[PDB]
Structure 1
Amino acid sequence: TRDQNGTWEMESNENFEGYMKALDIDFATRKIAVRLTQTKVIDQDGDNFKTKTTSTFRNLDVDFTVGVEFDEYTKSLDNRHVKALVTWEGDVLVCVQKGEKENRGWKQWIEGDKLYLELTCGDQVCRQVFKKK
């Protein structure tokens, strides 16, 4: 399915530390970030996505239209400008963030009752698993 609608609760968060370090996020921020449960809300209407990922610490709001390039300023993470593009590869939602960092992006897909999100930066991969609430 390409339907990723819902309120999603984080089950696990593997190598978030490595991904953030690859993004040059400072030590103290990483130490807080790695321990927090995230909730991801996805409002998907055709090709229009509105997503909010939240924790006790920080919020990440990102909206996009599939197949439409958009500029991003990654204010909630490393503070960089990237050219982002989200597209479908089969049932996998694929984001490439073109800019300074190589192999920067993510892939997101539904398997059964779970949402999987794999974030990449350089040689680092963070794997997050969410279940629907």
Structure 2
Amino acid sequence: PADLSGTWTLLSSDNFEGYMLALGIDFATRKIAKLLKPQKVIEQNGDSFTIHTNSSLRNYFVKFKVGEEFDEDNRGLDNRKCKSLVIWDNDRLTCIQKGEKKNRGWTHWIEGDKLHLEMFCEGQVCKQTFQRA
């Protein structure tokens, strides 16, 4: 495991548009979303996590415990329901989201004081890095 806690600000994004296309987000929302610099707040208590994703266009919140399946109604995103599970891929916090979309999920990890994030959905992978605020 690794400590991923803190308030993070998006430093670099990469292929976020491909990621969103794969989700089926419309033109209007994608144009606005790609212009955002969302903040990520990670509260970590042992294997208990609460991750806040704050941005202009929308605020997001996910609360989970590692190894505990939980449904994710993304009616604030792609409106598609998913059955999620987060596990420790050695020091990388990886989530598998089973649902309509295939090979959808995300992975967080930290190297130095920089937070990395990969968000994928059936072929598209959006890489992002954040800096401790």
CA distance in 2, matches of 1:112, 1:54: 23
* Alpha-carbon distance between aligned partners in 1 of 2:67 and 2:77, rounded to the nearest angstrom: 24
Give distance in 2, aligned partners of 1:38 and 1:75. Answer: 19
Pairs aligned (count): 133
Instruction: Name the structure 1 match of 2:39.
Output: 39
Q: Which amino acid aligns with 2:27?
A: F
User: Normalized against structure 1, the TM-score is what?
Assistant: 0.97
TM-score, normalised to structure 2's length? Answer: 0.97
Check if 1:9 corresponds to 2:9.
yes
> Partner of 2:56 in structure 1?
56
Cα distance in structure 2, aligned partners of 1:87 and 1:46: 13
Q: Cα offset for 1:75?
A: 2.0
| 1:86 equivalent in structure 2 | 86
State the shift of 1:77 in Å. Answer: 1.2
CA deviation vs aligned residue, 1:58-112 (integer Å, no higher than 9, x gap): 1110000000000110122100111100000110001000011111001110011
Indicate the SS of the match to 1:18: helix
In the alignment, the residues of structure 1 paired with residue 72 and residue 37 of structure 2 have an alpha-carbon distance, to the nearest angstrom, of 24
The yes-or-no answer on 1:106 pairing with 2:87 is no
Amino acid across the alignment from 1:132: R
Instruction: Find the aligned partners of 1:75 and 1:5 in 2 and give their Cα distance.
Output: 26
CA distance in 2, matches of 1:38, 1:99: 25
Whether 1:123 aligns to 2:119 is no
Q: Give the Cα separation in 1 of the matches to 2:130 and 2:28.
A: 25
**Aligned match of 2:70:** 70
Gaps of 5+ in 2: none
Q: CA RMSD in A?
A: 0.8
Structure 2 SS opposite 1:68? coil
